[PDB]
Design an enzyme around this catalytic site. Structure first.
Site, PDB file in Angstrom:
ATOM      1  N   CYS A   1       0.348   3.721   3.326  1.00 33.30           N
ATOM      2  CA  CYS A   1       1.037   3.307   4.516  1.00 33.30           C
ATOM      3  C   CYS A   1       2.489   3.733   4.510  1.00 33.30           C
ATOM      4  CB  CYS A   1       0.832   1.831   4.832  1.00 33.30           C
ATOM      5  SG  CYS A   1       0.717   0.675   3.465  1.00 33.30           S
TER       6      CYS A   1
ATOM      7  N   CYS B   1       0.784  -1.229   0.000  1.00 26.33           N
ATOM      8  CA  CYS B   1       0.000   0.000   0.000  1.00 26.33           C
ATOM      9  C   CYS B   1       0.807   1.265   0.000  1.00 26.33           C
ATOM     10  CB  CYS B   1      -1.044  -0.011   1.117  1.00 26.33           C
ATOM     11  SG  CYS B   1      -0.915   1.243   2.405  1.00 26.33           S
TER      12      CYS B   1
END
Ligand SMILES: [Mg+2]
Ligand SMILES: [Zn+2]
Lengths: 274, 288, 97, 97, 63, 109, 45, 375, 303
Positions: free
Chosen positions: F36, F33
């Site tokens: 993140c 991701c």
RNA sequence: GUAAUCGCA
């Protein structure tokens, strides 16, 4: 070729030497130089702020250009110096005839008016826009000469009219109709119609087209009263009330382009005045 | 600085059928501004699709140029008035429209019946002027194309007069370059001026032209899934029968290389060349 | 001369529209030996699934640079007189004498 | 009102042709141009003597011409001096071809 | 390397020589543009800025 | 190096079981991701601002999927704030959030 | 108010037109007209 | 009735899911169409993820922003908080020309703070403490005025997680369907819903029946059905064993009466549409400049959905046409590629091993040229 | 029926000369010329490369002299090093050197390079040694675009700057042939790319396309590098001063009926400042409006 | 500072 009659290209290495005292005064006034010596050293060092001050100095100062064979009174004129990056003094093309100048190696001189009276004289009297007629017979001295004349002649030359446009007689048997000149110019830009391709343009009751004193080649009169008068270069439809309903001019994109550019120059001048 | 940003410096609305907007692109290296300007102008003038009337139906009018009872203007005049009507739509394919004004009303305007998708921009446009009590019933076909000026559905099969239709919404476009240079570095600034007919705003035209250019330049990145001394050796030196030698001479074959390039079927084509000859030349070649 | 030039150009356009793109452009690809008729193209499309574009790309893949450069007379921006394009050296030598 | 005359008027204003138009307008109201030149010179000399530090990047003659144009009902920038709002930064100067 | 006054041999000797050499170049390196039968010595070039061809042919050479 | 450290689920269970005198901040992240990855910089700056007042740990969601599932991890850029008092409730923040909100959360609750 | 020309324009015709423009609109308008004419001429050439 | 008075041509689309910043519901391993030779020749300069994993999408707010950027009229329905973050999200939605009249702001609930309980032994959490105003929306708080003008309704599976929010979104969907609108359902299974296929199907069984257009990903399609993924998932070749078009007989069991078109999207590389009368798949580009931040491929799905919604809403009568659906898929692929490029350019690259760049609050990012240095 | 491209011919005439031909067959009427001119302008001037930019010699007095044991002067050696083709994908300055000894010929193979930089031709003639001499020279390798003027002639002694041309593509050409499809005037596009070995013609085509897309992308951004720029802007607007935070307040937040809201949205009125600046007569001017709603909006604005 | 000589346009 992209300068105006009042503007001329001037190299920076010449301008820094001509306007050196002015840029020294500028460096002294602003918090960039304490004394004349430090300002001269900074100017010699070619600092970037020196060029900015030089540009700000000569925005309203006139330059007097002149040529060695100063035969007539147009040998010396006045322009607005524009800072350029080179060593060659740019000059407007239309002003060449006056100086009998060709770019085959000719050189010119530059003069800076110091006094305010001299600056006013240079800006008012000696400018190009105030001297467009030769003092011999009062004829236009600044006119398109070599390439602009060729372009104008190609624009206004015309089209193949007779045997050149058609191989057989049309007896056994032009097409585009444009309401506005903008539409025709856009179609030419879009390559829809060629430069010499004939077309019809509707006019708003002006009849300013210069043509020969020739009667209509053919006149079509219908029962209801509307009669079509076909001329050599235009069509004028009218009604029973002797009212001019529609007028269509038969021309090419070149003539309408020249007419539109002249009219728009005049109108833009008038609008910018306000 | 180091990030390309755009801003609309000027915008105005002279009329409901004319718009003007000026845009800017501050950070640009040398040589990029002219290319971007040319590409954006080409996209604005050719790659933007517009909506306009492409067909007409005049049951009353029996001629292309005639004066109907109460129309007060020629059919050519009403056609030229119809071709100047601006429309806004997102149509896919063709559609139909209709105007059924039946009255002695002075002006016929904004009376066209359009499906929901199509919309009119300027209602004040003058189609015709009825001076007598009469029923004006005209059929209209509307299409949307990326500047495809030439579209004829039936080529005037029925009583339908084809109307010349320009699908260019952008009236005019121009670009300029301002070069600001400090010492070694030189920065260029692009100024884009867009004139539209009112169907879309200059900002929307800019966005559409940019997306069209991107879509044009994408397919190049597309990918598909996956599951000599013979010149100096003339045929004269090689011992050949006279007949095949003359045939090769007539067939403009002078060197071995040439013969080698020639194929068996092609060789057979030469006049007077038997199949057995193909064998003879092949055998002599394999001898070497 | 402009009339005859335009007439030859229009005749070439009509021939291109009639015979097809592959058959028309087959005159500048001598290394391609296959039936260039529309019937054969449709048969090949039904058999393998390749349209006219794929077969035309495959044909152009077998074209020499030398031939490509000659084919450029068919460019839409600068169309060359087909009579001059298809002239013989014997006639061209007579131009200067 | 012509639709596509924005850039032309913009360039006329930016270049400095307004000065030429104002000079012609002010010479259309004067019998002898030499006396007008002398009067403008005297007024600019008075302006310079009044405020020395004010000028140096702003021209007193252009200031006189702008005051005379503003007093006649025509709005003109002070001394015909305008700045480029699209300037990239300090030390960056435009290149006028 | 051509001696001056090559027209002592025949008429239009320079023209014949120039056109003959251009044709050969066009045939050998297959650049059809070098010799245009319609207008010998002139070719049709494009604009670098816009990319549109010019209307009339221009003279292309290496002096 | 980085003050935030990769920790398994077992040591997280041990930390939540045993008492502590500092707030526990647990970050579920996955390498894939994008958001993140940014959140990690905010966590590092927060650990710099709070050197020993708080503890910031991270756990890889891909390696420990059942542990995230039982903790009601609905999305990748999630942060779990555990108060020192064993009677107060936990705070879960979903999505990328400003550092000022995290500071206000760890200060007030 | 300007005439519309459907004939070939030459150097003498250009000089006549420039003289008439100087007489009618003055030198101030003629300067800008001549600049625009030069631009269009260079473009078409 | 203000329908004829002020509805306007572009019909209004309604987004109901949630407003969040840089949120990823879940992620599954996937494959991408790229030129492996150009990647191996520029392995040092280009950022290539070791394991390629993409997300089904972002949030309804990003979808609304993209659809507004595409020129369509969008309206976002939901509830936020009176805190600074909720106001910032509302300002971000308004500046992008998204109608936020249906957005409700309440101070008693926080924007993104979800109070939860520690629970029993074993780490079993519970959210009974207090929601985060994103799962809290009362049925009486639904703005019927937006749903009346709305001819399209867009929501996601992330909303149906909470039992109260599931009832709320079901009420909104049925109200829209009764007030005459086509329901667009973008199923984006969050992380907890990947445990069992049957449980995930039963969970989304209240959905999938009240919607007319459903968008699913290839991995989600394989998970909902009994197909198990059998691909290398990391080989440097396109062997036609990925990007496979499943037969319509596999799609048939999950089909229902009100369903009209079903979209299967394997990123921007290939989109498959399924209809009762025809089936086809259009390929697309997916080799785009990728940064670590943009590796998720979240903007691609948002752009695809925005383009599909725009194309469908403009001509609702041609939802079942083959050529119009092909044009819609091509436009959606183009919009996804454009949005991916825009996110890659807006959010640059993380600093390299040598990081001495000025830092913004809690973040530091450089450009593509700055990242491509020797050391 | 589709849009396809393929490589017609690939020719490696030399290690520093490549040829490639590509065809875009199913192209429409006005797209072909635009794509062609854009690709031409991109291949020539918008593709960047790497070349030697600085040369440091050991014990030469000046760059216009001759060194014993070498057939070429310092200027000839600089001109030879100027035509050394290199391949690199990272920006910045790197260092190289040439350490050859003994009689022979020093070529590009003697050059030792950083791991990122590589040589293409590998056999270019740098200089010729006719006596046993130790030839040591230093090289600086940089990656830029266009041509670079050797501005710092007066600089650190012993190092001579050489102007470098970073244009990898030598020449390009395109032709547009018709497709003969009747009414739909489709055309075929052809592209010819001549590179110099630093990158293949297909890679040059892809890089030019990506550069064009990168140049045309910014027009699709919001009107004028952190993910929290909007929050910071809103915080500054609300904190700094009044009459600026009023801009951040939209009609959406102000409770209004659907009719007035939609009418104001159609009237290009979004923020509260635009509503305040507009007059009541202008509000009445818009269609589907009445005097009743004016009292409502005025009351809820005063509230 | 003056010459001589050449060039320039
Ligand atoms: Mg001369
Ligand atoms: Zn001769």
């Amino acid at each position: 070729p992209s300068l105006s009659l009042h503007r001329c290209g001037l190299p920076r290495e010449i301008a820094i030497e001509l306007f050196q005292t002015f840029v020294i005064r500028g460096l002294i006034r602003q918090h960039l130089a304490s004394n004349i010596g430090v300002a001269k050293s900074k100017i010699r060092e070619k600092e970037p702020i020196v060029w900015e001050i030089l540009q700000e100095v000569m925005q309203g100062h006139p330059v007097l250009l002149n040529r060695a064979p100063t035969l007539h009174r147009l040998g010396i004129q006045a322009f607005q110096p524009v800072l350029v990056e080179g060593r060659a003094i740019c000059l407007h093309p239309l002003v060449c005839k006056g100086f009998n100048a060709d770019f085959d190696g000719d050189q010119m001189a530059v003069h800076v008016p110091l006094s305010l009276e001299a600056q006013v004289e240079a800006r008012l009297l000696m400018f190009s826009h105030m001297n467009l007629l030769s003092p011999a017979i009062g004829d236009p001295i600044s006119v398109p000469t070599q390439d602009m004349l060729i372009g104008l002649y190609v624009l206004t030359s015309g089209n193949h009219r007779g045997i050149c446009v058609n191989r057989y007689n049309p007896c056994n048997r032009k097409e585009p109709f444009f309401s506005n000149s903008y539409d025709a110019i856009g179609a030419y830009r879009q390559k829809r119609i060629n430069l010499d391709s004939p077309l019809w343009l509707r006019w708003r009751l002006d009849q300013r087209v210069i043509a020969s004193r020739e009667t209509p080649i053919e006149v079509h009169y219908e029962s209801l009263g509307t009669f079509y008068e076909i001329y050599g270069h235009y069509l004028i439809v009218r009604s029973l009330k002797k009212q001019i309903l529609f007028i269509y001019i038969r021309t090419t994109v070149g003539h309408i382009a020249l007419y539109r550019e002249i009219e728009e120059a005049i109108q833009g001048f008038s609008r910018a005045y306000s | 600085t180091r990030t390309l940003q755009w801003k609309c410096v000027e915008s105005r609305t002279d009329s409901k059928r004319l718009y003007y907007g000026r845009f800017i692109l501050s950070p640009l290296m040398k040589g990029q501004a002219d290319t971007i300007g040319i590409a954006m102008r080409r996209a604005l003038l050719g790659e933007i699709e517009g909506t306009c009337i492409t067909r007409v139906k005049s049951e009353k009018v029996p001629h292309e140029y005639s004066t109907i009872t109460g129309i007060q203007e020629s059919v050519h005049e009403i056609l030229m008035n119809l071709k100047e009507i601006i429309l806004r739509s997102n149509l896919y394919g063709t559609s139909d429209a209709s105007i059924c004004v039946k009255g002695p009303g002075s002006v016929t305007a904004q009376d066209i019946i359009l499906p929901p998708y199509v919309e009119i921009v300027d209602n004040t446009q003058h189609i015709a002027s009825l001076t007598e009590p009469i029923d004006f019933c005209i059929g209209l076909q509307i299409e949307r194309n990326r500047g495809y000026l030439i579209k004829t559905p039936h080529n005037f099969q029925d009583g339908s007069y084809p109307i010349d239709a320009v699908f260019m919404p952008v009236r005019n476009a121009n670009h300029s370059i301002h070069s600001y240079g400090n010492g070694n570095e030189k920065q260029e600034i692009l100024f884009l001026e867009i004139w539209t007919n009112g169907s879309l705003t200059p900002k929307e035209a800019l966005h559409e032209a940019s997306r069209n250019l991107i879509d044009l330049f994408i397919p190049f990145l597309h990918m598909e899934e996956d599951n000599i001394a013979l010149k100096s050796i003339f045929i004269d030196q090689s011992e050949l029968p006279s007949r095949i030698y003359n045939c090769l001479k007539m067939s403009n074959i002078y060197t071995l290389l040439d013969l080698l390039n020639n194929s068996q079927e092609d060789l057979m084509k030469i006049e007077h060349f038997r199949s057995e000859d193909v064998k003879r030349i092949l055998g002599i070649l394999e001898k070497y | 001369r402009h009339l005859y030039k335009k007439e030859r150009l229009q005749a070439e356009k009509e021939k291109l529209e009639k015979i097809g793109p592959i058959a028309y452009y087959s005159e500048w690809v001598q290394a391609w030996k296959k039936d260039t008729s529309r019937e054969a193209i449709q048969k090949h499309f039904e058999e393998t699934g390749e349209d006219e574009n794929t077969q035309l790309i495959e044909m152009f893949c077998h074209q020499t640079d030398r031939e490509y450069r000659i084919m450029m007379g068919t460019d839409i921006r600068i169309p060359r007189d087909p009579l001059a394009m298809r002239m013989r050296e014997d006639q061209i030598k007579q131009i200067w004498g | 009102r012509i639709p596509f005359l924005e850039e032309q008027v913009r360039k006329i204003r930016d270049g400095g042709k307004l000065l030429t138009m104002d000079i012609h307008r002010l010479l259309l109201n004067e019998d002898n141009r030499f006396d007008f030149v002398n009067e403008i010179a005297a007024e600019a000399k008075q302006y310079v003597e009044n405020n020395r530090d004010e000028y140096g990047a702003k021209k007193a003659i252009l200031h006189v011409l702008s005051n005379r144009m503003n007093d006649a009902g025509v709005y003109r920038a002070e001394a015909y001096m305008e700045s480029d709002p699209f300037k990239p930064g300090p030390g960056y100067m435009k290149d006028e071809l | 390397r051509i001696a001056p006054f090559d027209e002592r041999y025949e008429q239009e000797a320079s023209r014949k020589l120039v056109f003959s050499e251009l044709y050969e170049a066009s045939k050998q390196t297959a650049n059809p543009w070098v010799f245009e039968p319609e207008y010998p010595g002139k070719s049709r070039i494009f604009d670098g800025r816009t990319g549109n061809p010019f209307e009339q042919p221009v003279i292309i050479g290496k002096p | 190096d980085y003050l935030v450290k990769k920790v398994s689920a077992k040591d997280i269970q041990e930390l939540i079981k045993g008492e502590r005198n500092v707030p526990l901040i647990i970050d579920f992240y996955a390498t894939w991701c994008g958001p993140c990855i940014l959140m990690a910089q905010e966590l590092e700056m927060l650990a710099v601002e709070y050197e020993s007042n708080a503890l910031i740990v991270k756990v890889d969601t891909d390696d420990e999927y059942e542990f995230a599932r039982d903790m009601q991890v609905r999305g990748l850029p999630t942060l779990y704030f555990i108060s020192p008092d064993p009677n107060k409730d936990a705070i879960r923040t979903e999505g990328l959030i400003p550092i000022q909100m995290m500071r206000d959360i760890i200060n007030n609750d | 108010n300007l005439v519309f020309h459907n004939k070939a324009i030459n150097g003498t015709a250009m000089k006549r037109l420039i003289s008439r423009l100087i007489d009618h609109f003055g030198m101030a308008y003629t300067s800008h007209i001549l600049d625009q004419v030069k631009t269009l001429g260079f473009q078409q050439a | 009735e203000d329908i004829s008075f002020s509805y306007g041509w572009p019909p209004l689309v309604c987004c109901f899911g949630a407003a969040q910043h840089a949120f990823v519901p879940s992620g599954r391993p996937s494959n991408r169409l790229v030129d492996h030779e150009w990647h191996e020749r520029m392995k040092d300069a280009i950022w290539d993820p070791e394991k390629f994993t993409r997300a089904p999408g972002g949030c309804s707010s990003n979808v609304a922003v993209a659809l507004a950027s595409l020129g369509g009229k969008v309206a976002f329905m939901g509830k936020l908080g009176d805190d600074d973050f909720g106001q910032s999200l509302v300002y971000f939605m308004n500046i992008n020309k998204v109608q936020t009249r249906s957005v409700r702001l309440d101070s008693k609930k926080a924007t993104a703070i979800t109070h939860m309980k520690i629970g029993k032994r074993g780490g079993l959490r519970m959210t009974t403490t207090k929601p985060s105003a994103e799962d809290s929306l009362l049925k009486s708080e639904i703005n019927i005025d937006v749903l009346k003008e709305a001819k399209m309704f867009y929501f996601n599976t992330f909303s149906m997680l909470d039992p109260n929010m599931r009832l709320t979104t079901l009420r909104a969907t049925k109200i829209s369907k009764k007030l005459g609108g086509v329901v667009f359902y973008d199923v984006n299974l969050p992380f907890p819903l990947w445990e069992s296929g049957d449980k995930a199907k039963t969970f989304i069984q209240q959905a999938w029946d009240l919607a007319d257009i459903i968008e699913v990903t290839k991995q989600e399609l394989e998970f909902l059905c009994g197909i198990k993924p059998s691909e290398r998932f990391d080989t440097k070749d396109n062997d036609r064993s990925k990007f496979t078009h499943y037969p319509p007989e596999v799609i048939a069991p999950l089909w229902h009466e009100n369903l009209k078109v079903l979209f299967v999207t394997n990123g921007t590389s290939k989109i498959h549409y399924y209809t009762k009368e025809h089936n086809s798949a259009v390929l697309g580009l997916e080799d785009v400049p990728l940064t670590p931040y943009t590796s998720d491929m979240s903007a691609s799905g948002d752009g695809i959905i925005a383009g599909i919604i725009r194309m469908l809403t403009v001509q609702p009568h041609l939802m079942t046409d083959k050529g119009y659906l092909e044009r819609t898929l091509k436009y959606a692929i183009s919009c996804g590629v454009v949005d991916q490029w825009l996110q890659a350019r807006r959010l640059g690259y993380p600093p390299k091993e040598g990081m001495e760049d000025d830092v913004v609050p809690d973040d530091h990012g450089i450009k593509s040229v700055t990242e491509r240095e020797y050391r």
